[PDB]
Amino acid sequence: KKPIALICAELYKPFQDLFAALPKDCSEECQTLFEDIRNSESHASAWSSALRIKGVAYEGFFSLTNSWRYIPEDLKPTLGMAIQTVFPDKFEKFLERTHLHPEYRDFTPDYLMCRSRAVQEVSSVSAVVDRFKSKSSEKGRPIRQEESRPKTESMQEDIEVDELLIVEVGYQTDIEGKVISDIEKWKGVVNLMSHLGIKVNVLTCADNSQTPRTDWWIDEKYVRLLLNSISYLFKELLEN
């Protein structure tokens, strides 16, 4: 009964609150997408746009929560780019060992960081891993996590090495399936990194609208923003 353009009207305030809180580039993308929904000619068109807003907004709030830089998908570095720029002396061997699985070079995680020496810098990778493991162990939130390890090598105290942190996030109903499929996708890379002597950590996590608001991977303040905007929108597009 309600037209979609009209649905976007009633949600003007919640979406203004949403756009005001996201990072700039993230806000703009969501703003363009919202106008796409308002001007949607089809229901499939408006649903697809909303799905995108859901993922892009959530990742902007994930960045804010973690004091990480939000990186638009178009600007996200690939695994090959990180190896070439963080581990240049191993890039040739990386290419050779990816001849059978060249798709690995193009893997693009949501976040691709390295320890502070287009890959972002993080002061401590282990600190990020620990807070993921803490919330998983405290709130029962599903994660998967893997660290490359050559043979049975021990960590060492007399020398520092460069390392990568690869993070996948998401806002979708099937959280377990998200983290199980992510770690499986990256398992071959981790084993590759192990053979190259490159230290990497992969983390994957997910939230859905049934998660208790105090238990998400984003600040509860950001949860209310998503629930009041995008999640309500999905209800309106179905019921109308």
Epitope: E153, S154, Q156, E157, V161
Partner: antibody
């Protein structure tokens, strides 16, 4: 001077439990990994466990996995070994050790003797 | 586990002569960080062990310079250029490249008489 001083050794019945301590002095304990090594009488050296400076990384010899726990208290400059389900084969002198900058055993305590017998 | 094979098991040597102790690793001890974590210890009778050499060839501070180490990969050697009476005891190699850290079985240095 760097000194490591173990305590807590003694006599335990098989299946029993014992907690060892190691008091470290003469260096900034909280910045370094700490280790336990043991030696059964007349036998060679066997590494037991390793704990990183901030306790994030812990390794165990396969013969103590599931039975021993290594831990530390950095404000009190103390390293611990909690031993459980002890067996006669665990009878040994227990040394704490550190590399003071590496995973090698550069400094050793005088050791503490643990006898597991009924 | 890494297996460290020491040879000989016992080494009789006259005071003032050189001694050489071999340590062979079942796999390479070269770590992906570029270091090789093979180390040498002396345990004098009734005492705790003492570090002599760390990462193949670095003499530990204060260790007398008659001790030196060499090698690479899986093959390492501890040399005492001129044996003294105080060098009596058991020499161990050990490795901390891989978990578990492991020791050789020990080489007993015996003063010849």
């Amino acid at each position: 001077e760097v000194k490591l001083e173990e305590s807590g050794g003694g006599l335990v019945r098989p299946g029993g439990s014992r907690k060892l301590s190691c008091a470290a002095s003469g260096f900034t304990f909280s910045s370094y990994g700490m280790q336990w090594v043991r030696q059964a009488p007349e036998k060679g050296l066997e590494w037991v466990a390793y704990i990183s400076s901030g306790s994030r990384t812990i390794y165990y010899a396969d013969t103590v996995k599931g039975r021993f726990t290594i831990s530390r208290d950095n404000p009190k400059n103390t390293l611990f070994l909690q031993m459980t389900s002890l067996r006669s084969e665990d009878t040994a002198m227990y040394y704490c050790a550190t590399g003071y900058g590496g995973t090698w055993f550069a400094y050793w305590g005088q050791g503490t003797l643990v006898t597991v017998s009924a | 586990q890494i297996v460290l094979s020491q040879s000989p098991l016992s080494l009789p040597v006259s005071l003032g002569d050189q001694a050489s102790i071999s340590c062979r690793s079942s796999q390479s001890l070269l770590h992906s960080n570029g270091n090789t974590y093979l180390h040498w210890y002396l345990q004098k009778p009734g005492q705790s062990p003492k570090l002599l050499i760390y990462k193949v060839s670095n003499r530990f501070s204060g260790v007398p310079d008659r001790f030196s180490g060499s090698g690479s990969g899986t093959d390492f050697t501890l040399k005492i250029s001129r044996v003294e009476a105080e060098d009596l005891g058991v020499y161990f190699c050990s490795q901390s490249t891989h978990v578990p850290y492991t020791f050789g079985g020990g080489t007993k240095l015996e003063i010849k008489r």
